[PDB]
Write an enzyme that holds these catalytic residues in place. Structure first.
Site, short mmCIF file in Angstrom:
data_model
loop_
_atom_site.label_atom_id
_atom_site.label_comp_id
_atom_site.label_asym_id
_atom_site.label_seq_id
_atom_site.Cartn_x
_atom_site.Cartn_y
_atom_site.Cartn_z
CG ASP D 65 -0.22 0.26 2.51
OD1 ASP D 65 0.90 -0.27 2.69
OD2 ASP D 65 -0.76 1.01 3.35
CB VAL D 89 -1.57 -10.06 20.13
CG1 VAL D 89 -2.79 -9.26 20.57
CG2 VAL D 89 -0.53 -10.21 21.26
N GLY D 91 -7.70 -9.86 11.56
CA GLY D 91 -7.71 -11.31 11.40
C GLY D 91 -6.43 -11.85 10.79
CB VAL D 92 -3.11 -10.29 10.25
CG1 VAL D 92 -3.64 -9.22 9.31
CG2 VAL D 92 -2.89 -9.71 11.64
CB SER D 93 -3.96 -13.92 14.53
OG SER D 93 -3.50 -15.02 15.30
CE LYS D 309 -23.01 -9.05 8.27
NZ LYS D 309 -22.40 -9.67 9.47
CD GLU D 396 -62.29 -17.96 11.20
OE1 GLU D 396 -61.12 -17.76 10.84
OE2 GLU D 396 -62.59 -18.62 12.22
CG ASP D 470 -59.11 -16.36 12.86
OD1 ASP D 470 -59.24 -15.45 12.01
OD2 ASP D 470 -59.69 -16.36 13.96
CG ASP D 472 -57.75 -20.65 14.85
OD1 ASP D 472 -58.00 -20.62 13.63
OD2 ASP D 472 -58.55 -20.24 15.71
CG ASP D 474 -61.82 -23.78 15.69
OD1 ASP D 474 -62.53 -24.80 15.59
OD2 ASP D 474 -61.32 -23.41 16.77
MG LIG Z 1 -60.61 -18.44 16.40
#
Ligand SMILES: [Mg+2]
Ligand SMILES: COc1c(N2C[C@@H]3CCCN[C@@H]3C2)c(F)cc2c(=O)c(C(=O)O)cn(C3CC3)c12
Ligand SMILES: [Mg+2]
Ligand SMILES: [Mg+2]
EC number: 5.6.2.2
Lengths: 239, 147, 98, 776, 83, 98
Positions: D65, D89, D91-93, D309, D396, D470, D472, D474
């Site tokens: 660089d 010590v 992420g170069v380790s 992600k 419903e 709904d 559920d 029913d």
């Molecule tokens: Mg219901």
């Protein structure tokens, strides 16, 4: 976005869901305590409220509100109708609720609305919930995960035989007549003594059913056939 | 689909299970009470060294640490501890190093915490007598539950 | 309410943004429709509701042979686009009405 | 001195869980990507913009660089060089541990330094080896050839594409990429990178207008950059980025972009009078026929739906992007009226092409304030008269019916409420079906007629029928009843594809300002797992770097699946026994004849089970000898609540899917966490006793300040929520019903909805009861 | 109470003494009481100041009203015009 | 007062309307329960009160004339401004009656 689906899979999945839910959680009684889920939830709520047999009455609206606001996610009119039936002397052989007011009559009259009546626990209903605080049964979750409900009651009374049951489900149904408490206790003691007693031995103590409204049973063959296999037919005749 | 005998058998099995679970719960509770009762009973014979140790401690945590540092002499309570046979009144989660070792008692953290919460009205002569009665009653209850 | 006129054909409409206190909108529209059924007012061709998430909006169509102002004033005089509120302040003071 | 060695060894033990895949070579490129990202972060504040990338012929890469060089100071704490502390010590380790040799060069203060790292172990302290005048850093690495397998190579295009994308995103930064094996040199440098990105993408196709819309603003800490152009193609491609990270599945910014574009284009086309000259109207899909666009957003702390992600779930981003897009796009249509006309022409052509593919219709008479038209009183009709542009909803209950009436688009949507349960037209007779009022009103509202004598499916009043119930048990019953009616009485409606099913959500979560909707329980489990792994680090020992998020997510998902499988089979085996087999050595089939290791294995299992026990129970073991090939099968006996039971582990269980899945899960968990086992949050610390305990602690920590709401039915939602989640065409999801076989459907309907009870009972007993107990 | 340098106790004070835990004999528990006593004296003086004056009474009400107006106020919706 | 005793604060979870109505009818108000629910509904509508005293969740009616859903469907809790009407209630500032 729109994704396709075949009609057979939808039909099968939906109907199996409904059928299994109705069979396992709405219409059939447990063999250990003889109660449906709604009865168990009503009794547990009344026990938590502190509504004992030697204290003052409470209005029905308060109990119904607690039951449908903490444990039972359904309508309230059906819950009140369920509570009314547990207090009528011509419906249950041994009543579980104590009532004060107009609760109907054998003549066919209807009960008053829930803004008019009062209830409390009966004395025998305290034997269905004995030693509930000493970790004798398992607890499950409600529909929100905020409260806990018992899975079964630690009963001292053989409730299924002495009160009967009747319900309609998908693919099956049930119909059980009530009995007499002393005879059932004697039969249980005999079974504890012998452990290999036959059907004829048990009928020395339990001759047949015992309805709350008396009358006459006409014949003995159906009783033996039902006690031996599980299905039979009897005739009830007026006096 | 069931008949009469199946229903009766199911009821009997349910009763047996309920009674067993109730007995286990009560036994555990009794042992837990007896532990704390022993801890409190031992500390009423070394009252002066206990008070002297507590007064110089600047912080309750330091007092708790100093309490479980060295064994305490049994004194006048060795008889009622010997009356307990083996480990009938010993909780099942207790490590083998704690408790009586050789005429000297070894405490744990919860026992020290219970000691620190003792009120001054329990130093009277009459309030001291209840410990022995409660201990003997608990031992009898434990034996009956174990039967 | 307001009057807007088209810049191409010269047609005009009436737009209502707000209504008085304690007035039902569906009943108001139904009453206007019933009144215009029997030729009580002149100049109304179409009537519909176009309210959405942005806000209230009621559209009234002006006929070709009339001016909007007369129709608007007739609607003020005959419908619940203008109401009266009688004030009467009575309350309890030391357990007595006053 | 020794802690660093132990940490490097611990990393070397399981390289995959720190770098990624070692078979396809993804981690090999990931190391280079980490190095380049760190360098460009240094070059972000650099005096100039220059980065050197070289692909050498000896299977090595050197990157240099031109920013400020890494300081060569001394560390007050450790007493060693600051550069060494920077490199290796806790992420170069990872790269240094995975590279046999690493060359460190620092050129600063007019002097040249040089140091060599060997498998993460320094050989000599940094010393001056020359003099210079420039500032920067250079790193060359030789990857390990034993840990890395099957690739041992670098591909030019893989790095070239990423470098070009970075150069486009990082305006004013130049990157040089070269390879020494064959000899290549590529230089990337653009000022208007986003605009140049659009030009580069819109190259092989034919743009229809030269002017390219573009802008860049920043409000409330959110940076927005948009650029787009219309080609002559028939496909759309939108590319999204957030902090220079791509999302393939989009998110809130994409939704805001789409909504703003749709509203702006529709408003402009309406005002200008183009839509009145030709008797057509354009939808959102018509506008996005051929389009190339790029969206990049700058946000301080983005929140994602998973560790991988691919989806942004931040709330205010949508509002910001929508406002910025809507404010400025209107002005562009006026500044360039010449290019505006071409796009409108293409949109009108697409819309006209869509119209010609429809069926034939006749205008219907709707129900209004001045006429009833002989329609049911409980129907709430619409204003559109063309049946091919209308929708009908079947709801419903009364409460949900009112909620739907309040929050609909009354231009082209109608509502019809149902009260109670409806008749079963499979068990009833024809006249009974005709005399029922609910069915009669439904038939009248549909408008086709019934009876196979006047049934004309060409007079249907709406071309979309949507069922909303709904979530559920029913609602499933009502769905089945309605499907039975439609299939038995109006087959052509189903055949032509006019029936849909709606999908309302079930949960809603909120933590402060962030809120989100959840579809069902699987999504809830995924959200719970993801939300507990943010801002947390899990280290095997006290001197090892944290693991990767993706590996943790995979481990937790596999654990959850195995736990579900274990819970399914609870009726045959105790649940505690099955959980213990995870942390036990595999009992291979070869051990079923020794009769000496079997006893030791079962004794160890029983001893471990008896050691950890809170309830009142006891364990025992036994060995059974079988005549067949002299097998020896373990026997396990328990005592719970005064009852004794025995579970024979036969030969079938040894070779089975359950045991093999348990073993595969166990192989990744045995000896994973060392004794230290510390977990560190942003500022706190915590020791770990076991994987489960750490997971429970993380879950408990994450739930603080969290609000979760579960919807009992459709009547518990506000009308605005119902509209924006289920009824908005921009963001709704549905299902379309089709018929596959038409010869088994009759059998299934007859079996499940017929009068005879015995086939129904047998079907239920065979399917739901027995098949569930054994899912082998 | 104190009369000639010798404190005289009541029944409830003796009962409070008999209910004293052993953990209160450490160092910090002997200064917690001093701090709390000083704070109580300050609060008592401040409370006594209010009941003796009317302007001090009205200042509190003014402050509370201003706080309410700051916290819950909003804009006007209806428009008033001449005939 | 009943909602205050239940602990139904403005920054906690909602509660079913039936529970509140049952408590009110069973402890303080000796009348019917439908008019009590009608009273509770009006205190939560933005087009009825200038400063609402109850916070609601569900279908509570509209200005168009629609009715609210039955009490088995909705949920309520206290509004933030309603805590200023009951400030210092536990410091003996008012009288109590049977
Ligand atoms: Mg219901
Ligand atoms: C309006 O629905 C109901 C009817 N009807 C439905 C019929 C067709 C439509 C025209 N009205 C009639 C009368 C009815 F007769 C009884 C009950 C009923 O008892 C009940 C409950 O909770 O106890 C609840 N519901 C509704 C939740 C279903 C009932
Ligand atoms: Mg009913
Ligand atoms: Mg009424």
């Amino acid at each position: 976005e729109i994704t396709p689906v075949n009609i057979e899979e939808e039909l099968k999945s939906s109907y199996l869901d409904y059928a299994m839910s109705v069979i396992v959680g709405r219409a059939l009684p447990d063999v250990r305590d003889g109660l449906k889920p709604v009865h168990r939830r009503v009794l547990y709520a009344m026990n938590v409220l502190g509504n004992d047999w030697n204290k003052a009455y409470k209005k029905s609206a308060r109990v119904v509100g607690d039951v449908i606001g903490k444990y039972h996610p359904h309508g309230d009119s059906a819950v009140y109708d369920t509570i009314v039936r547990m207090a009528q002397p011509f419906s249950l052989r041994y009543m579980l609720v104590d009532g004060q007011g107009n609760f109907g009559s054998i003549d066919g009259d209807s009960a008053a609305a829930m803004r008019y009546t009062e209830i409390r626990l009966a004395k025998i209903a305290h034997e269905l919930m004995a030693d509930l605080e000493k970790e004798t049964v398992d607890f499950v979750d409600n529909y929100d995960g905020t409260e806990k409900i018992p899975d079964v009651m630690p009963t001292k009374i053989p409730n299924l035989l002495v009160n009967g049951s009747s319900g309609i489900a998908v693919g099956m149904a049930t119909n059980i007549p009530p009995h007499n408490l002393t005879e059932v206790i004697n039969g249980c003691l005999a079974y504890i003594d012998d452990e290999d007693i036959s059907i004829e031995g048990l009928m020395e103590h339990i001759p047949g059913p015992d309805f709350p409204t008396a009358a006459i049973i006409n014949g003995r063959r159906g009783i033996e056939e039902a006690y031996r296999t599980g299905r039979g037919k009897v005739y009830i005749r007026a006096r | 689909i069931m008949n009469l005998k199946d229903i009766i058998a199911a009821f009997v099995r349910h009763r047996r299970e309920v009674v067993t679970r109730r007995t286990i719960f009560e036994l555990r509770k009794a042992r837990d009470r007896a532990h704390i009762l022993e801890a409190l009973a031992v500390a009423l014979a070394n009252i002066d060294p206990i008070i002297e140790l507590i007064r110089h401690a600047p912080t309750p945590a330091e007092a708790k640490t100093a309490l479980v540092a060295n064994p305490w002499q049994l004194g006048n309570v060795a008889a009622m501890l010997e009356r307990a046979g083996d480990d009938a009144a010993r909780p099942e989660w207790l490590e083998p190093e704690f408790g009586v070792r050789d005429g000297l008692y070894y405490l744990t953290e919860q026992q020290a915490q219970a000691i620190l919460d003792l009120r001054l009205q329990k130093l009277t002569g009459l309030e001291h007598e209840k410990l022995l009665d409660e201990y003997k009653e608990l031992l009898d209850q434990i034996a009956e539950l174990l039967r | 309410a307001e009057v807007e006129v088209d810049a191409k054909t010269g047609r005009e409409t009436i737009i209502v943004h707000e209504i008085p206190y304690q007035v039902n909108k569906a009943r108001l529209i139904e009453k206007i429709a019933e009144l215009v059924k029997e030729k009580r007012v002149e100049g109304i061709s179409a009537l519909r509701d176009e309210s959405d998430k942005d806000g209230m909006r009621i559209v009234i169509e002006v006929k070709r042979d009339a001016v909007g102002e007369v129709v608007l004033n007739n609607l003020y005089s005959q419908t619940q686009l203008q109401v009266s509120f009688g004030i009467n302040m009575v309350a309890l003071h030391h357990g007595q009405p006053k | 001195s020794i802690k660093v060695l132990k940490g490097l060894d611990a990393v070397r033990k399981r390289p995959g869980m720190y770098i990624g895949d070692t078979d396809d070579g993804t981690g090999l490129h990931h190391m280079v990507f980490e190095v380049v990202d760190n360098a460009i972060d240094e070059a972000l504040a650099g005096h100039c913009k220059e980065i050197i990338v070289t692909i050498h012929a000896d299977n090595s890469v050197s990157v240099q660089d031109d920013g400020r060089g890494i300081p060569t100071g001394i560390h007050p704490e450790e007493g060693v060089s600051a550069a060494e502390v920077i490199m290796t010590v806790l992420g170069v380790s990872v790269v240094n541990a995975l590279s046999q040799k690493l060359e460190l060069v620092i050129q600063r203060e007019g002097k040249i330094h040089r140091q060599i790292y060997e498998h993460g172990v320094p050989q000599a302290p940094l010393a001056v080896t020359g003099e210079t005048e420039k500032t920067g850093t250079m790193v060359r690495f030789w990857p390990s050839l034993e840990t890395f397998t099957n690739v041992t190579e670098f591909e030019y295009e893989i790095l070239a594409k990423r470098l070009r994308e970075l150069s486009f995103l990082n305006s004013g930064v130049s990157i040089r990429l070269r390879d020494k094996r064959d000899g290549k040199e590529d230089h990337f440098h653009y000022e208007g990178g986003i605009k140049a990105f659009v030009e580069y993408l819109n190259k092989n196709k034919t743009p229809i207008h030269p002017n390219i819309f573009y802008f860049s603003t920043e409000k409330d800490g959110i940076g927005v950059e948009v650029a787009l152009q219309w080609n002559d193609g028939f496909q759309e491609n939108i590319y999204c980025f957030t902090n220079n990270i791509p999302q393939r599945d989009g998110g809130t910014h994409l939704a805001g972009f789409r909504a703003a574009m749709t509203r702006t284009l529709n408003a402009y086309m309406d005002k200008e009078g183009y839509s009145k000259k030709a008797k057509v109207s354009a939808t959102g899909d018509d506008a996005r026929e051929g389009l190339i666009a790029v969206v990049s957003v700058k946000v301080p702390d983005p929140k994602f739906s998973s560790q991988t992600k691919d989806k942004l779930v931040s709330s205010e981003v949508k509002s910001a992007v929508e406002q910025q897009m809507n404010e400025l796009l209107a002005e562009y249509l006026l500044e360039n009226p010449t290019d505006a006309k071409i796009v409108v022409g293409k949109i009108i052509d697409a819309a006209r092409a869509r119209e010609a593919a429809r069926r034939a219709r006749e205008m219907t008479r709707r129900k209004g304030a001045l006429d009833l038209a002989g329609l049911p009183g409980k129907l709430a009709d619409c204003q559109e008269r063309d049946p091919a542009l209308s929708e009908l909803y079947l709801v419903e209950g009364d409460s949900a019916g009112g909620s739907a009436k309040q929050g609909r688009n009354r231009k082209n949507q109608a509502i019809l409420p149902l009260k109670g349960k409806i008749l079963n037209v499979e068990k009833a007779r024809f006249d009974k079906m005709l005399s029922s009022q609910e069915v009669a009103t439904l038939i009248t509202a549909l408008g086709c007629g019934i009876g196979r004598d006047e049934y004309n499916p060409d007079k249907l009043r709406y071309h979309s029928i949507i069922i909303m119930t709904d979530a559920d048990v029913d609602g499933s019953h009502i769905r089945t009843l309605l499907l039975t009616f439609f299939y038995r009485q109006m087959p052509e409606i189903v055949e032509r594809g006019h029936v849909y099913i709606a999908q309302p959500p079930l949960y809603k979560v909120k933590k402060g300002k962030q809120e989100q909707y959840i579809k069902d329980d699987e999504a809830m489990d995924q959200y719970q797992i993801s939300i507990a792994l943010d801002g947390a680090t899990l280290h095997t020992n006290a001197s090892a770097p944290a693991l990767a998020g993706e590996a943790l997510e995979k481990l937790v998902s596999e654990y959850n699946a195995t736990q579900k499988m274990i819970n399914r089979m609870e009726r045959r085996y105790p649940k505690a026994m099955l959980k213990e087999l995870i942390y036990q050595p595999t009992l291979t089939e070869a051990d079923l004849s020794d009769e000496q290791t079997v006893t030791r294995w079962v004794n160890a299992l029983v001893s471990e089970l008896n050691d950890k026990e809170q309830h009142g129970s006891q364990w025992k073991f036994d060995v059974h000898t079988n005549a067949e090939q002299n097998l020896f099968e373990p026997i396990v006996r328990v005592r719970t609540h005064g009852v004794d039971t025995d579970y024979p582990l036969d030969h079938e269980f040894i070779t089975g899917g359950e045991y093999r899945r348990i073993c595969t899960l166990g192989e990744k968990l045995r000896g994973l966490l060392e004794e230290d086992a510390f977990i560190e949050r942003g500022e706190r610390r915590q020791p770990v006793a076991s994987f489960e305990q750490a997971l429970d602690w993380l879950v408990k920590e994450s739930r603080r300040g969290l609000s979760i709401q579960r919807y009992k039915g459709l009547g518990e939602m506000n009308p605005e929520q119902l509209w924006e989640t289920t009824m908005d065409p921009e963001s709704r999801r549905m299902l379309r019903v089709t018929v596959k076989d038409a010869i088994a459907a009759d059998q299934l309907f007859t079996t499940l909805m017929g009068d005879a009870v015995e086939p129904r009972r047998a079907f239920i007993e065979e399917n739901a009861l027995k098949a569930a107990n054994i899912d082998i | 109470g104190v009369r000639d340098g010798l404190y005289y106790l009541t029944e409830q004070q003796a009962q409070a003494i008999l209910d004293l835990r052993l953990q209160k004999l450490t160092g910090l528990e002997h200064e917690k009481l001093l701090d709390e006593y000083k704070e109580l004296l300050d609060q008592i003086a401040e409370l006594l100041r209010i009941l003796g004056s009317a302007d001090r009474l009205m200042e509190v009400i003014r402050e509370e009203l201003e706080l309410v107006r700051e916290q819950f106020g909003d804009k006007r919706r209806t428009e008033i015009t001449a005939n």
